[PDB]
């Protein structure tokens, strides 16, 4: 299962999770790559945990505890982008919601907090507008 | 204007075009029928384009025994889109719409006036500078 | 048998070299020599005789360089360059990684080469070449703490963190007006992988929360995923989870469908009409998705309309909630709905729907005031620029003495928010070629394009304008239709005016002596706008 | 730029050697610097005639009429050869370069050797030399078409046959035969600002009027009203 | 005002490339300009090549016997070549 | 090297032989003698450190930075004051005349005279004297000692011209009747392309005395061998 | 015997670009295994597919698994063993071109081969390990079985 996946994902130029990738995840599968998830490179494992989101609600739901064990196990991983991807997944398969709680144990965030907070508060002079608000009416532009 | 003067004609070239089709698909009885007014056959007949589930020809198969000798070319069908080299299709056409003979062998396309035609760059243009007049006399006849 | 002897022949050939005495492996080659049954008196010979001294060669030669004025720093940068060169075709990875093994943190030269800058575009080059080099991994990591290729720029978290972290300061400061050339170069790294756009998408999410400006990262994150989306990617279901779409499980299933399709389709229509009309919609913030909303505008305004009479109305009452439908929120607690503009809002729609579907049209001149109160909509306004820009932009429009034109004049007067929009249109239609048309036509339907660009001009949009229009005199058009356009311009201008108008306005006004505003302008501008 | 990137043969990169020529070629040719010598001048009168085709055709208009397809007959050699271009193939650089240069000697139009029969012999194959010498560089030859010295050696003597078969035969009559193939074309063409066309405008060629139909000038200008309507 | 023999004269852009104006840029590639030519519905072209403001090197016309007087033989021998393949080419039929 | 205090081959030898730290001064000879810049001095251990030699390096900027000096004085050729070019050049004369016995410093100080109507005689008579230089000289030094020194000049117009009466008699006698081609056959600018002529023209230059040395040499040879 | 390339595929999509010919259907079919993406032109008349089959699929040199040629002449009365009987959909062709990713200074890791079969065409892109017994000009049998 961990060549197969190697060889369904082991393209390091395709770093978007290719299409299909619904189909590649079923449930024996899932069950499959947390027996052998660090045996893969970094970005086999990047595809494989981002090719969650592409699934079905119903089967994203279907699996999770699956999908849970493994962002810890990616969570527990040495790669950093591996261990991103795990802070962010690991409120997902339980509701769907991505984690925001990145601050901690990221100097890199930690810095986004500092610096960009500062930029987008002196920012806020003729602050630019969404897509969005070119449909909204008067009220709800002003809202 | 330095081209043929002569090509194939109505009948012929309407007949050619329906014959060189993907899908044209013929019995054991018929191939073996149409191999005997193919003066120029070594006479051997070549293995099916489709063995099992039954035996079974295709049409260009037997249009690259009628193609003498060993001759390249590249022409476009004359109904070829005008986009397919841009896509990733370029050298397998979803109409067989590129005319590819190579070696004196037909392998892909379907042929029209734009191919069998008196245009310069034709493939009766090329089987004449190649094989010689007499090769292509007889290359005339067979396809007729 | 001993290889002593091919050793000692080896290190004869390598002594008797030019100025071999210079490398520093020479010690070993020296032992080599000695313990096999060398001399220690022949290598003195085999250095010192072939040495000439062309350091002190080359040391001379640039004290010459130096002595005739020439500056040192441009041969400096030219040797670096060479050495760069060499090192560039002679580079071993391994040997990266073996300095690295030695010690984690390389020996302290590595360090000196990152003081100077050119060894930093060197460790760039050579990272972007080779990216699977630890050392390099580590080097360029220690840069970005202190042009990473994407690849390179995407590889660590810590590196593309710093580089995002800079990357959307300098979008924020360039604010609009850069927005379109500080976009594609990052945005490209984040629609290089699935990771990396969802890192990105989620920090841009977590940043649009705050008040003060965060709806300018929004806008960033919204041009990132139709940049994933025109790569052909899958950005709906990350989009989907970063918003409150869990809570609602039809309509995310709904919407993830009709956008991975990329059309709309009457039964999820049918399914998000009864959510919607029902008193427990979701929140009009979630399905106000500008991707949404243009395959709104891309099916019930294109020439048509492929769109059943019956179901005409949910499409219609849907457009009408997502635009006008305004929701009072307190603290994440949805306080109220207010469906009060949705009537109005689906009555301009229904109408101008059934204005651009008819096509039967010459009735246009007669719907022209309902066209310009239902135009009043904003969200209407947006669907008549589009299917203006369907209609015109179609080949053999013009065989009329125009209308659509002048629409464009009202949308652009109302709404300033569609000013890039229309610009971006009429340029389309300004470099567009036409056969059947005469040249004479050509340039009259050209200076009827001017026109429309000086009357967008005289609603504030000065500056972009006047940009394209120096853009295509310098880098193509004829001068004619420059002289009209700036001829117009001076019609109705007065002062005063601003720095940025002068610069803009100013250096194409000497390209030509032709025809008085002009000679005014030109006194008050070189007394007051130097 | 494209014309460096495509015709410029680089013995400065190895591994494009490595990958498109045996090793003991690709020593050879970096060892010595003479074959490299070589090249370079190939290079530099391929560039000559470069600025000689955008002297001779400045519409910049590729189609030409000549008497040998090149194309096809290296189609033609590799499939009589059966030449596989995915390895590295064995085609001295030099080789083409000594075969190229003695097949235009032996490729002779007007015969005898003095100034200005060398001249004319030059001025009449110019094209079709310039045609040969940037279709077979060195470059391509062993960058793209990967032939062997053998086939290389057969299409050098396959051009030399079909090119002295092309020559116009002496007793020919041109004349009538361009009489006629002009008049043929004639019988088929429709009767047409405006301009007269068809067999009365032609008519009007041959037969010299003192008086056109349609006398018309096509006057081009050259100051800012090359560009500005207004003033033009 | 205006050269005799000349009564109407039309102004136009060309719309194929044959007659756009091609150049040579710094990058050796051809660009085609859009240049404003000039059709007249007369013949003194010994008078317009005169004229200010006019290209006398592209500037030609449709008659033979201007070019004899004009111009010269081998002016005449090539422009009546362009006309002969002008009207043979006009319907799309090629002549070597 | 030593007329500028410049360390050379003497210096390594006195300093390696009847030396029991070979290790030291070797150590202290490569750091010393380095390239006087402080850039290079961070980077010399890591250039070396592949076991790259140096030598490629130096060898490479020695022919980048010796082309320049050759493209410098090339530009100062017409460039401002006469007197500041002739002045920059005679520093640079006087300063390689150290090494235009070294063979790849004399073409600096051929390219330096090629630059100079007029020099210093000490340098003409030294590049007259030594063979090598002669030899290894531009025809721009020449012209000057020729314009004092009548003799050389004699002597290299005496072999050229030797051929030139061997080919005017073969031509005389070429083996070959016909009407068509003889000896009075080629025209005069066909005759004028003789190499003779113009190495004479190109050794006389533009100044008269040389034309007038020339003069009485053809003086000389016409009536003493009675040659036309 | 000679195996240039054995697996098993699965159909994705039958004509995604619309019908061109009402007994030929260009099948677009993945690996399992592998990824080796296949689109080849099957005739569904004789031998009906559909969307989601899954089948065996081997590229050979002969069929005779001995390694014997017959040149390419049809012979119906050869009483050797034939590896064709373990097939269903048996087709014959020649290989006619073998492209890659390759570049300037470094070979292909993927490799595209275009196959022709009398007019039916069969693109088979994928690892360069597994294709590297794809020659060019080189006679060639297509295998199909279905598995239930």
């Known amino acids: 299962t961990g060549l197969w996946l190697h060889n369904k994902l082991g393209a390091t130029d395709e770093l978007w999770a290719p299409p299909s990738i619904a189909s590649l995840l079923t449930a024996a599968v899932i069950d499959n790559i947390r027996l052998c998830f660090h045996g893969l490179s970094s970005a086999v494992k990047l595809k494989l945990l981002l090719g969650t989101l592409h699934l079905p609600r119903r089967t994203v739901d279907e699996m999770k505890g699956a999908l849970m064990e493994i962002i810890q196990l990616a969570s527990l991983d040495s790669d950093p982008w591996v261990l991103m991807v795990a802070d962010i997944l690991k409120s997902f398969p339980d509701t769907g919601s991505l984690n925001l709680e990145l601050e901690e144990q990221n100097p890199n965030v930690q810095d986004i907090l500092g610096e960009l907070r500062e930029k987008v508060g002196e920012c806020e002079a003729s602050a630019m507008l969404p897509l969005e608000c070119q449909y909204l009416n008067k009220n709800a532009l002003t809202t | 204007s330095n081209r043929p003067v002569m090509g194939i004609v109505q009948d012929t070239l309407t007949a050619v075009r329906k014959f060189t089709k993907r899908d044209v698909f013929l019995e054991r009885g018929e191939v073996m029928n149409l191999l005997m007014f193919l003066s120029t056959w070594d006479g051997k007949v070549p293995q099916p384009a489709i063995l099992k589930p039954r035996p079974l020809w295709t049409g260009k198969q037997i249009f690259s025994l009628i193609i003498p000798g060993h001759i390249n070319c590249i022409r476009t069908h004359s109904t070829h889109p005008d986009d397919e080299d841009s896509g990733p299709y370029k050298h397998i056409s979803p109409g067989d719409t590129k005319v590819v003979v190579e070696n004196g062998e037909l392998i892909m396309g379907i042929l029209c006036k734009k191919s069998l035609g008196t245009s310069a760059g034709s493939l009766v243009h090329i089987s004449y500078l190649e094989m010689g007049h007499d090769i292509t006399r007889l290359f005339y006849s067979n396809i007729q | ?530 | 730029k494209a014309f460096e990137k495509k015709f410029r043969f680089d013995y400065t990169n190895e591994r494009a050697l490595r990958r498109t020529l045996q090793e003991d070629l690709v020593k050879d040719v970096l060892s010595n610097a003479h074959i490299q010598n070589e090249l370079e001048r190939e290079f530099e009168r391929m560039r000559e005639d470069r600025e000689v085709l955008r002297v001779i055709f400045p519409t910049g208009d590729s189609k030409v009429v000549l008497p040998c397809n090149l194309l096809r007959m290296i189609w033609n050699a590799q499939k009589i050869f059966h030449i596989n271009p995915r390895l590295p193939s064995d085609l001295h650089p030099i080789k083409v370069v000594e075969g190229v240069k003695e097949l235009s000697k032996k490729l002779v139009i007007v015969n005898g050797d003095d100034p200005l029969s060398r001249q004319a012999q030059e001025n009449a194959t110019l094209l079709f030399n310039i045609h040969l010498r940037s279709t077979l560089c060195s470059r391509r030859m062993a960058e793209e078409f990967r032939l062997s010295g053998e086939a290389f050696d057969w299409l050098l003597g396959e051009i030399e046959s079909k090119f002295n078969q092309a020559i116009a035969h002496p007793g020919e009559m041109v004349g009538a035969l361009a009489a006629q193939s002009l008049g043929e074309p004639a019988t088929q063409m429709t009767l047409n600002k405006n301009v007269t066309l068809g067999v009365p405008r032609l008519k009007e060629l041959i037969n010299i009027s003192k008086k056109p139909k349609t006398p018309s000038l096509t006057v081009f200008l050259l100051g800012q009203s090359a560009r500005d309507a207004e003033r033009a | 005002q205006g050269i005799e023999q000349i009564s109407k004269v039309y102004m136009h852009l060309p719309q194929t490339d044959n007659k756009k104006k091609i150049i040579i840029t710094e990058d050796g590639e051809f660009k085609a300009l859009q240049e404003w030519i000039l059709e007249t519905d007369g013949v003194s072209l010994m008078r317009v090549l005169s004229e200010k403001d006019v290209d006398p090197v592209r500037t030609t016309s449709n008659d033979i016997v201007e070019i004899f007087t004009v111009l010269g033989i081998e002016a005449v021998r090539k422009a009546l070549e362009r006309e002969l393949y002008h009207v043979i080419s006009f319907d799309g039929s090629y002549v070597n | 090297l030593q007329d500028l205090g410049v360390a050379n081959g003497e210096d390594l030898k006195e300093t390696l032989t009847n030396c029991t730290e070979p290790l030291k001064a070797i150590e202290q000879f490569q750091t010393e003698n380095g390239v006087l810049l402080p850039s290079l001095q961070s980077a010399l251990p890591f250039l070396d450190l592949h076991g790259t030699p140096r030598l490629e390096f130096h060898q490479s900027v020695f022919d980048e930075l010796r082309d320049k000096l050759l493209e410098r004085v090339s530009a100062i050729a017409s460039e401002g004051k006469a007197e500041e070019r002739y002045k920059k050049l005679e520093d640079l004369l006087e300063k390689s005349f150290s090494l235009v016995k070294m063979p790849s410093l004399q073409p600096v100080v051929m390219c330096v005279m090629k630059h100079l109507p007029k020099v210093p005689e000490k340098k003409l008579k030294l590049v007259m004297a030594d063979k090598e230089l002669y030899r290894a000289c531009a025809v721009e030094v020449k012209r000057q000692i020729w314009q004092d020194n009548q003799a050389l000049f004699g002597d290299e117009v005496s072999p050229l011209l030797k051929q030139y009466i061997l080919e005017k008699e073969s031509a005389l006698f070429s083996t070959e009747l016909s009407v068509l081609h003889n000896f009075f056959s080629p025209s005069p600018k066909t005759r004028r392309q003789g190499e003779v002529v113009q190495r004479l023209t190109r050794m006389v230059g533009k100044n008269v005395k040389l034309y007038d040395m020339v003069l009485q040499f053809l003086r000389t040879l016409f009536l003493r061998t009675r040659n036309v | 015997a000679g195996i240039l390339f054995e697996d098993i595929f699965d159909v994705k999509d039958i004509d995604p670009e619309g019908k061109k010919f009402d007994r030929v259907s260009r099948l677009h079919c993945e690996s399992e295994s592998f990824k080796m993406d296949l689109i080849l032109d099957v005739n569904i008349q004789i031998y009906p597919v559909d969307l989601g089959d899954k089948f065996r699929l081997v590229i050979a040199s002969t069929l005779y698994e001995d390694g014997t040629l017959d040149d390419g002449e049809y012979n119906p009365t050869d009483d050797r063993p034939s590896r064709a009987d373990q097939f269903e959909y048996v087709m014959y062709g020649k290989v006619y071109r073998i492209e890659g990713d390759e570049t300037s200074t470094e070979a292909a890791t993927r490799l595209s081969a275009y196959v022709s079969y009398g007019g039916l065409l069969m693109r088979l892109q994928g690892d360069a390990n597994n294709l590297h017994g794809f020659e060019v000009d080189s006679r060639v049998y297509l295998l199909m079985k279905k598995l239930a």
């Open chain 3, 1 to 530: 048998g001993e290889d002593d002897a091919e050793v000692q022949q080896e290190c004869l050939h390598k002594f008797s070299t030019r100025d071999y005495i210079m490398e520093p492996s020479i010690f070993n080659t020296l032992k080599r020599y000695f313990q096999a049954g060398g001399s220690p008196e022949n290598v003195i010979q085999l250095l010192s005789e072939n040495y000439t001294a062309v350091a002190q060669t080359v040391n001379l030669l640039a004290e010459w360089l130096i002595q005739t004025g020439v500056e040192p720093v441009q041969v400096q940068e030219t040797v670096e360059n060479h050495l760069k060169s060499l090192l560039i075709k002679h580079f071993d990875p391994r040997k990266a990684d073996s300095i690295f093994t030695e010690e984690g943190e390389t020996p302290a030269w590595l360090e000196q080469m990152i003081a100077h800058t050119t060894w930093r575009d060197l460790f760039y080059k050579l990272a972007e070449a080779h990216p699977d080099c630890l050392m390099l991994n580590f080097t360029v990591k220690l840069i970005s703490d202190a042009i990473t290729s994407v690849s390179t720029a995407c590889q660590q978290l810590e590196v593309f963190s710093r580089v995002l972290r800079t990357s959307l300061a300098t979008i924020l400061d360039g604010g609009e007006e850069n927005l379109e050339k500080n976009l594609p170069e990052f945005a490209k790294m984040v629609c290089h992988g699935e990771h990396t756009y969802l890192f990105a998408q989620a920090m841009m999410s977590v940043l649009a929360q705050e008040e003060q400006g965060g709806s300018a990262v929004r806008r960033i994150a919204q041009e990132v995923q139709r940049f994933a989306q025109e790569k052909g990617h899958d950005a709906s279901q990350i989009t989907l989870a970063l918003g409150t779409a869990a809570s609602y499980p039809r309509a995310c299933q709904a919407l993830g469908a009709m956008l991975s399709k990329g059309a709309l389709n009457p039964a999820d229509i049918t399914v998000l009409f009864k959510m919607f009309t029902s008193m427990d919609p979701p929140p009009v913030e979630l399905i106000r998705v500008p991707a949404f909303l243009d395959l709104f505008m891309q099916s019930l305004f294109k020439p048509g309309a492929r769109i059943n009479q019956d179901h005409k109305h949910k499409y219609i009452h849907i457009l009408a909630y997502a635009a006008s439908v305004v929701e009072t929120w307190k603290k994440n607690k949805r306080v109220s709905i207010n469906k009060d503009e949705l009537k109005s809002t689906s009555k301009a729609v229904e109408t101008v729907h059934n204005l651009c579907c008819n096509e039967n049209a010459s009735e246009l001149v007669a719907e022209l005031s309902t066209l310009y109160q239902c135009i009043r909509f904003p969200v209407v306004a947006m669907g008549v620029l589009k299917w203006v820009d369907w209609t015109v932009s179609e080949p053999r429009y013009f065989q009329l003495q125009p209308v659509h034109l002048a629409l464009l004049d009202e949308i652009s007067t109302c709404h300033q928010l569609l000013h890039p929009q229309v610009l971006q249109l009429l340029v389309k239609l300004f470099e567009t070629e036409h056969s059947q048309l005469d040249v004479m036509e050509q340039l009259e339907l050209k200076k009827t394009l001017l026109d429309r660009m000086v009357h967008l001009l005289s609603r504030g949009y000065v500056l972009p304008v006047v940009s394209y229009i120096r853009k295509c005199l310098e880098k193509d058009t004829d001068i004619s239709l420059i002289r009209y356009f700036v001829t117009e311009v001076l019609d109705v201008i007065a002062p005063p005016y601003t720095s940025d108008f002068v610069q803009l306005f100013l250096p194409i006004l000497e390209n030509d002596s032709i025809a008085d505003p002009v000679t005014e302008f030109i006194a008050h501008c070189k007394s007051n706008f130097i």
